[PDB]
């Protein structure tokens, strides 16, 4: 008997994981949709074969007794409303990043999960569900290298377009490093500073690229980590955390190697959605199984949504500022452990 | 509305593939079941909540109307048996590796799918569903390297049973290598030799290990395959396709690096059942699609377990023999192509 | 006709590049060495059957007219005031690191050089001359990667002495880096900012272990250094340079893969002394062929020293400022290009 | 008081050789020289300003007095001849590969070695001193794999002239391999096979390209050994060493790292060359410090050169036979060992 998903936002990436959902996963259809633009949510229903109902808005569609469960990926700012609603409603919620574009926004819906007794929001940063990023997590959770004391990482992608502005590299990119980094050490951000190198010849006048980005947390670790979205030559994510014994890395995706013309080669990915396409679909599947046999969800936390929320507030704030900005965070409420 | 699907054998591998249609696919269920050890059979029934009956033997499961395809994975001899009759009662069959024990065997197979119409055989030799193998596939398919003139290729395993016998290693072992190569290069083979180097000591008194293989196609391509299943030092698998203008090779899986007490290193399996995970999920997979969505399976076909089986005999036969024998092959049927 | 070298200073170092001038190198012959414990420069001259006068001190030696050339590789502070005298007294001087212990040390011999008319003292920044380095260098030349815009590299020691203290980490260790960067990238250090990690558990009390250098160009390109000498696992020397177009990155010394108990690995070098070995050779070598066959010296320059001197000092600024300190040089004067 | 070198045959070789003893190496200097082309060993005594005679034919050269040492580095099958000479004339001789054209040839020389009481022959088999061969030898040595069973190796080559014969590929080229190889496993050669794969469209029509060379030891080591003069992309040496316990292999020549367009590279070498470059250097060096050192030589043997003529004459003849020929030795003379 399979949980009934309603999906909030019919664009490209609610489209993904509709088609996940329907024809890759397991347990689990989409019985209902809304988008802004309810002409391209009913040739959604068409083309994927739905058996869904087409609603002109969210309310309408958190009212349906049918779903269980909520895809929000509608627009960004539009996330914030559409949680609250499902977690009043009592549905459980699958969010994508971000959870809220405002830390105190993140806040809100901390406190209304609170209240509802459960875990009914699970976040959408799916790196902690990619093979890399779990066997740190193992290795660093068996001591292999001992205390953590810096991490230098980068997320490098090869050219974006008009739209991309300069706070969008803290925000919508490097907002993911911000969530797995501090789930992978247990630890909480202190101070952000950003700093500007020359800037690229592929960004365009508008854009400031690249950036450095240093943190440090409570414990002491520093954390460098590089945004250079203008990088030419592919999508690529680096991650290294030195230890007091050892140091551990993050791989590279697999390919073939390649001798030919002087060169040994391997293949780097061109397309950002390429890269985390397994983590996607054993986030969901998880979401899922974590539902039908836990009666709440498993995932990153509304809290977690928060604390990026904070931080990357923090670094908007040193990204224009130029100076040290501090990262403030409220106390951990005892419902998050 | 999903493929009902009825299991011949409910071992230790019947079993995986249970879990991953129950559990991690998209449209498919169990409905039936039957093993020979009948209690063993109505243990995992309860087991994985399975909403299946349970026959004595395969006759009475092949007559329930219910069961459009059924996957035979039980004992290897007892294949060939379970196929013939599912193609007459011309139902969809996924047939684990071997086809049948004996080339005649897969010819019966063979020529009563080409009687039925169409294409209910698929054999499960999941190596053309890993992602290494495909992306050599698709840098072949592109003349990425010319022609292929020789294939060096490796199947090493850590230990093996008192069960472990010489004829296992060509049979049960180097099978996948003879399948996925000439997959790969589109030839057939000509001569197969074998050649026995100095015997390990992590092999048992009446094994012969490791082995080389040497097998020619009609084409001229050279391969030579080292099958080495007491190496001790984990489960590896290695391919590399020199060709007229350079050379392409398959990856390692996925592995962070470490650096601690003087060495920079990755992680080797231990557990052959790891290493092809995702090619079993996307192999099962890929029979569910291609029958709802076309009325036929699309894998691995009956003739392509034809030519594993002939092949397979040359080997044991020049492996007793120690001559340069022949594989012999009847002319590909033109329901093949 | 071989050129005649005395040497000042017959410690450990000096005895290394008396060996390799006696028993490896070509065109050279080490006629006179002092030392401050003459008895220890007269074992030296018997441990390498030496053909070699003894002095008491720089002044004797730099009187007798055999030795068209000196090596200063005397204890540390000891050196600014060799080299000064043998400038004088007109011979040349290769000069280990560093060139002097204070910014004004190192103009003051800039001014006498600048005097003697043509180059006499070469800087032993070996970095220069290893196959590495020399490589990174034709890439930049040959603009393969576009505009320079950051650095990320490390250098790290297994573990240190009761001796090794907090400043020696930017005097002794990033010296290098701090020569052979700004050769690569044809720049000037503007800032330099310092940040101190967790210290580490292999780290003595009164060492402050890692520590992270933050250094900037004129130009923009943003350098992140991190030192870290009680690292435990080995010596390392790494070097990313991320461009506007693409990466290049320093490579691993030379070693054997081996596959063992559940890892394949290769070797990473404990001896700081190891890593560069080839570079002191071939540094040297370029000493003496450079003076025979163009009546001058061609390495690093006196400049070079005073470059690293001034930088040296505001690390060492920044390094209990916990500022960004700022690095101010004087003109390069033209005697310099 | 350094040793005086005559140079038997001023071709390319020849050429570089007086190069590195006159301006790269240490103790040693060329005193003489002969080459059939009188007029161009005149030519060489002054390209390199040497101080030497020029004698017409090897005998006047071996009668001087000065020469306490010769290097045979002649037009090939003029190499037995001008040893033999040397034997007798009683001076040291370094001889390039191969030692002579034919097996009686080798013995001949070994049988005037043996009489004349110590080691005068040594044979420029320089794999040995290349620090790749060097770490695998110490691996072995340590049994850090346990007993070697299989090795699986390559020679590869970008093109060849209209000059290369299908015989010349085991001659020429597969003849280090065959020299390194025994002295690693420390066995015998037993028997040899080779076979022809499809013909690449890169090698004219008079030649066989590539082949395969399969070759057991003594012990029961199975060798396969891969030549492809034609293959394109680069100069590349690979060789891996299959234990029981475990796997080692050799190195790649450093290369930086590139990441650009889509791709992740090292470089290959174009030209053989410099592949060896650093084991030419130390292998002049050691005859020279061994023979100062000592009063003998220590390098390959005139029995390895032996071994080689035997090896090399089987695969001549398993190159047209299209059998399984077999390699006779006899006895290893106490003398050797
Ligand atoms: N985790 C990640 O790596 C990742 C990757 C890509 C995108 N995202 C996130 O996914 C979201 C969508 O991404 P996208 O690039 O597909 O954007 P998109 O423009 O394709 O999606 C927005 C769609 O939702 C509709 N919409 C907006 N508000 C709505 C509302 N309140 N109710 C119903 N429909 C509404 C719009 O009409 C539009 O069709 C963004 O929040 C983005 O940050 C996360
Ligand atoms: N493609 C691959 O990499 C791969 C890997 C592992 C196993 N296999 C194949 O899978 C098959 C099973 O493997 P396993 O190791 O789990 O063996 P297993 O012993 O666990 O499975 C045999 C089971 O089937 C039952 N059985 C035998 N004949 C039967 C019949 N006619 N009808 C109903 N039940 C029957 C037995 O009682 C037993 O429970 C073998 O043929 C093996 O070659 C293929
Ligand atoms: N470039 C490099 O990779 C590198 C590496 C190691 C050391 N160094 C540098 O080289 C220098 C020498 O190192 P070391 O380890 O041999 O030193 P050391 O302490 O081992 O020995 C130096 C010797 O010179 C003597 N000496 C001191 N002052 C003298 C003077 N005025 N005249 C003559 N002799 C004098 C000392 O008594 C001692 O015997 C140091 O400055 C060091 O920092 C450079
Ligand atoms: N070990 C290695 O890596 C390696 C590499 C290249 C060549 N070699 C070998 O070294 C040898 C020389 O190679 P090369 O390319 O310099 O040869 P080359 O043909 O370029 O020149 C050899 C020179 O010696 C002269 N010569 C011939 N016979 C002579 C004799 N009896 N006495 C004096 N001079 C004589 C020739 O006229 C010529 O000028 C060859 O046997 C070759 O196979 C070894």
């Known amino acids: 008997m399979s949980l009934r998903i309603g999906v909030i936002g019919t664009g490209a990436i609610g489209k993904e994981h509709i088609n996940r959902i329907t024809n890759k996963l397991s347990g689990a259809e989409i019985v209902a949709v809304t988008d802004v633009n309810q002409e391209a949510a009913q040739k959604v229903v068409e ?17 349906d007794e049918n779903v269980d469960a909520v895809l929000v990926t509608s627009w960004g700012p539009a996330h914030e409303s559409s949680v609250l609603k499902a977690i009043k409603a009592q549905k ?59 991490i230098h990482c980068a997320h490098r992608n090869p050219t974006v ?42 960004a365009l006048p508008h854009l400031k690229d690249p950036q450095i980005v240093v943190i440090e947390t409570k414990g002491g670790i520093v954390i460098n980590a590089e945004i250079y979205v203008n990088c030419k030559y592919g999508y690529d994510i680096q991650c290294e955390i030195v230890g007091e014994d050892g140091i551990i890395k993050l791989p590279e995706p697999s390919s073939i190697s390649l001798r030919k013309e002087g060169r040994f080669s391997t293949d780097i ?23 039908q046999k836990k009666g709440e969800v498993s995932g990153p936390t509304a809290w977690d949504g ?14 224009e500022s130029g100076q040290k900005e501090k990262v403030e965070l409220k106390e951990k409420p005892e419902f998050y452990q």
């Open 47 to 63: 083309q994927y074969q739905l058996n869904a109902t087409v609603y002109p808005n969210d309310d309408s569609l958190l009212a």
């Open 92 to 150: 459980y919620v699958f969010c994508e990043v971000p959870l809220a574009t405002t830390a105190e926004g993140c806040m809100r819906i901390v406190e209304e999960e609170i209240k509802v007794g459960k875990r009914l929001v699970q976040v959408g940063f799916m790196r902690r569900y990619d093979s890399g990023y779990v066997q740190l997590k193992e290795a660093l959770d068996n001591h292999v290298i001992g205390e953590p004391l810096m």
């Open 161 to 202: 377009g008009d739209n991309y502005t300069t706070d969008m590299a803290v925000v919508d990119t490097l907002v993911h490093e911000i969530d797995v980094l501090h789930w992978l050490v247990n630890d909480d951000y202190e101070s952000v500073q950003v700093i500007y190198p020359k800037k690229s010849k592929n």
């Open 269 to 291: 990915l061109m397309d950002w959605q390429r890269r985390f396409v397994a983590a996607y679909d054993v986030e969901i599947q998880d979401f899922i199984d974590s539902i």
């Open 306 to 319: 928060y604390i990026a929320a904070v931080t990357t507030d923090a670094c908007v704030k040193a990204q």
